[PDB]
Amino acid sequence: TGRPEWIWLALGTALMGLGTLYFLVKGMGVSDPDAKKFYAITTLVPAIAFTMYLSMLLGYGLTMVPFGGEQNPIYWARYADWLFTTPLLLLDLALLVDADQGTILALVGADGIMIGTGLVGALTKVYSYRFVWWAISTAAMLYILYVLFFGFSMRPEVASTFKVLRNVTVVLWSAYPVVWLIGSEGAGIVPLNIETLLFMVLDVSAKVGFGLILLRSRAIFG
Amino acid sequence: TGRPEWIWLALGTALMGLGTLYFLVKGMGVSDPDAKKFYAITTLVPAIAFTMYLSMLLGYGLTMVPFGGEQNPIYWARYADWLFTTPLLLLDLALLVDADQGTILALVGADGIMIGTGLVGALTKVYSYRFVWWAISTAAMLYILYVLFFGFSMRPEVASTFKVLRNVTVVLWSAYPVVWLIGSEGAGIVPLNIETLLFMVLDVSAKVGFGLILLRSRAIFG
Amino acid sequence: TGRPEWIWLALGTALMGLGTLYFLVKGMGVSDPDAKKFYAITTLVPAIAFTMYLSMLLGYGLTMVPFGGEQNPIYWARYADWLFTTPLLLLDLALLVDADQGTILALVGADGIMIGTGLVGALTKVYSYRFVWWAISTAAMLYILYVLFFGFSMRPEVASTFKVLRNVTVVLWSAYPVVWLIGSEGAGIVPLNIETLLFMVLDVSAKVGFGLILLRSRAIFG
Numbered sequence: 001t002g003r004p005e006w007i008w009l010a011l012g013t014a015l016m017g018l019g020t021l022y023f024l025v026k027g028m029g030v031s032d033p034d035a036k037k038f039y040a041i042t043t044l045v046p047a048i049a050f051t052m053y054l055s056m057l058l059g060y061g062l063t064m065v066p067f068g069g070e071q072n073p074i075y076w077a078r079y080a081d082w083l084f085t086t087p088l089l090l091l092d093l094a095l096l097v098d099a100d101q102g103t104i105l106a107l108v109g110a111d112g113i114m115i116g117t118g119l120v121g122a123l124t125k126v127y128s129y130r131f132v133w134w135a136i137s138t139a140a141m142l143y144i145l146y147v148l149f150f151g152f153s154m155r156p157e158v159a160s161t162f163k164v165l166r167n168v169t170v171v172l173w174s175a176y177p178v179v180w181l182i183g184s185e186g187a188g189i190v191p192l193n194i195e196t197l198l199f200m201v202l203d204v205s206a207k208v209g210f211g212l213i214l215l216r217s218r219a220i221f222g
Numbered sequence: 223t224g225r226p227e228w229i230w231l232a233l234g235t236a237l238m239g240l241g242t243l244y245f246l247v248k249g250m251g252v253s254d255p256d257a258k259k260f261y262a263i264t265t266l267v268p269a270i271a272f273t274m275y276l277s278m279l280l281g282y283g284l285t286m287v288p289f290g291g292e293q294n295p296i297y298w299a300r301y302a303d304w305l306f307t308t309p310l311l312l313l314d315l316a317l318l319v320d321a322d323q324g325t326i327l328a329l330v331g332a333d334g335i336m337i338g339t340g341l342v343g344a345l346t347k348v349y350s351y352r353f354v355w356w357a358i359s360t361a362a363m364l365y366i367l368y369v370l371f372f373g374f375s376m377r378p379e380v381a382s383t384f385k386v387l388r389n390v391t392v393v394l395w396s397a398y399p400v401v402w403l404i405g406s407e408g409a410g411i412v413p414l415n416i417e418t419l420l421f422m423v424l425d426v427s428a429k430v431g432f433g434l435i436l437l438r439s440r441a442i443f444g
Numbered sequence: 445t446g447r448p449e450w451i452w453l454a455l456g457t458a459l460m461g462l463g464t465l466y467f468l469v470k471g472m473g474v475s476d477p478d479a480k481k482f483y484a485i486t487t488l489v490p491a492i493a494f495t496m497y498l499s500m501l502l503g504y505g506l507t508m509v510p511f512g513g514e515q516n517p518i519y520w521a522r523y524a525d526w527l528f529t530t531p532l533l534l535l536d537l538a539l540l541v542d543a544d545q546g547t548i549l550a551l552v553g554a555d556g557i558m559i560g561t562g563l564v565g566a567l568t569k570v571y572s573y574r575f576v577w578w579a580i581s582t583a584a585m586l587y588i589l590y591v592l593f594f595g596f597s598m599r600p601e602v603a604s605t606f607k608v609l610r611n612v613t614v615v616l617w618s619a620y621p622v623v624w625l626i627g628s629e630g631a632g633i634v635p636l637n638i639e640t641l642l643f644m645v646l647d648v649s650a651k652v653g654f655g656l657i658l659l660r661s662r663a664i665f666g
């Protein structure tokens with residue numbers, strides 16, 4: 001299409017599709033109810049991302065938002081994706097370590113706040129206010145990462161995989177606010193095509209990279 | 223109103239309203255926590271459908287979608303209905319057989335995908351792409367039916383009612399993609415008034431017919 | 445801004461922000477998994493309300509709805525707030541008394557119906573029909589209050605705090621339908637600025653007042 005970022009939307013679509021089919025095949029046969037949990041969550045994440053990447057690819061998950069005196073192309077379908085896939089990723093972490101239910105509700109709710117204020121900021125027409133929504137969203141993000149480091153001694157294989165995915169999680173999640181701030185939704189420093197490439201690389205890593213790590217671990221079996 | 227399909231929207235409204243009141247009365251008194259679960263789920267389904275049928279009846283759950291060179295009247299409120307009532311129906315099935323939590327998350331999530339890609343397809347303005355969304359949605363549907371047949375030996379009364387509702391479920395759910403494909407959202411083979419009648423007949427059967435079967439079974443008591 | 449109700453939107457923003465930070469601080473340290481549950485739920489409620497009050501303050505959570513021959517300013521962000529915070533409040537009540545899961549699903553679902561039909565009524569352009577949606581929503585509300593009084597003998601400290609919050613809940617929740625009926629969404633008897641003040645006073649009391657009561661009780665610890 002006439003959008004230079006199309007190629008990154010098509011590659012992300014393909015890679016999310018392929019990861020989904022891989023995990024679907026892989027979880028074939030699994031009977032341990034525990035492992036079953038991790039397979040369902042982990043397979044669903046790139047399945048949802050597949051649909052939202054394809055809706056961006058086809059033009060559906062795109063809208064124009066007037067601000068700073070211009071019609072800015074905003075991919076809102078990323079927030080419909082993240083709204084469901086980021087809590088699922090947190091649930092994977094939470095289940096690994098057998099979190100208390102209050103801690104899980106804390107994470108899911110802070111996550112909802114994170115993504116929904118990101119979406120409000122994305123669609124806000126007063127330029128300055130976009131960054132107020134960014135800051136609140138970033139603060140929800142920092143609460144989540146705090147809880148992942150200070151809110152949780154289980155068996156050695158659980159701990160190790162959990163420590164690895166936790167570190168993956170802090171590194172990739174932390175890059176999202178930066179990308180948003182310098183890209184088309186924020187300061188407009190980086191063109192939309194580079195921005196879309198960056199989000200594609202983070203999304204595939206946090207979704208398909210993260211799940212490859214988890215699903216190859218025996219940490220997922222009781 | 224000026225919409226010939228109005229009569230089917232009014233009959234579905236009435237029938238969903240009546241089923242809701244029936245199940246509400248019927249569940250009056252029930253103390254077995256197990257039965258309580260099935261009564262809550264099963265009563266909520268036509269209560270939600272009542273509201274969405276009435277919003278269609280009154281004109282609120284209707285929007286025009288330009289495609290194939292025309293303004294097509296699309297009843298989007300059916301997807302707001304299904305988004306909540308189809309997982310609830312699956313939960314009824316899942317609870318009957320004491321499914322593992324991973325299997326339940328699999329079903330709910332595939333269901334969300336099913337309905338949300340149905341909704342994207344319903345609102346997509348590029349005619350050809352409508353059917354890509356249809357196919358993905360149908361594939362989520364086929365995953366769900368697969369899990370209902372191969373993803374699950376409990377007491378005889380549980381098994382029997384579960385096998386009956388499962389068969390009801392495959393027969394009616396399978397008709398939805400066909401109706402969509404030949405009706406106003408898809409190939410436009412069947413007029414909207416006939417389409418609305420067909421969805422009304424399926425909806426009442428899958429919602430009020432299904433629940434009459436379940437709630438008369440002693441399978442719902444511990 | 446040019447909206448006289450701005451001051452009440454700014455005060456509610458501030459008060460919800462402050463309550464959120466207070467409860468966040470207060471729950472610092474808490475290790476009893478039970479108390480942890482109540483702290484997560486109770487902190488999340490004004491955190492969400494903070495964001496929705498601020499989105500109203502900044503103009504984002506406002507839309508114009510044509511009806512009765514005029515462009516009526518409708519604050520739709522209140523329904524995005526309530527959609528999540530009213531079930532959370534009900535969960536606090538439900539957990540106190542160790543409700544059965546079927547009773548909790550009953551409450552959450554009737555609540556969803558309550559808020560979603562409130563939102564449909566808020567955005568309906570046919571004046572008379574606005575009040576049909578009001579009545580259905582009020583009936584869902586009356587079901588919820590019924591279940592809170594007749595749908596539930598635990599330890600004395602649980603019962604007492606539960607009876608107090610239940611009474612707080614019936615008194616404040618019952619005022620919402622009245623405000624809606626006489627304010628800008630309904631009969632237009634009371635100007636939007638007074639209406640917004642009334643909702644601000646109810647919201648802070650039901651959210652921050654209610655949680656102060658709960659979180660000072662030892663009822664929240666196992």
Ligand SMILES: *C/C=C(C)/C=C/C=C(C)/C=C/C1=C(C)CCCC1(C)C
Pocket residue numbers: 081082085086089114115118119133134137138139141173174176177180202203206207
């Ligand atoms: C499915 C992929 C994942 C793990 C994506 C995560 C996205 C984020 C952590 C988003 C965070 C943002 C903020 C903290 C600030 C404002 C904008 C966001 C939504 C990009």
Ligand SMILES: *C/C=C(C)/C=C/C=C(C)/C=C/C1=C(C)CCCC1(C)C
Pocket residue numbers: 303304307308311336337340341355356359360361363395396398399402424425428429
């Ligand atoms: C409340 C009534 C029920 C059980 C309705 C079920 C609806 C479906 C199974 C819908 C399925 C569809 C697809 C598989 C393809 C595309 C369009 C849909 C959403 C009609």
Ligand SMILES: *C/C=C(C)/C=C/C=C(C)/C=C/C1=C(C)CCCC1(C)C
Pocket residue numbers: 525526529530533558559562563577578581582583585617618620621624646647650651
């Ligand atoms: C976060 C604050 C709370 C507890 C707000 C509760 C709101 C209600 C109980 C709303 C009820 C309504 C109806 C019963 C009728 C129609 C309109 C509503 C949504 C205002």
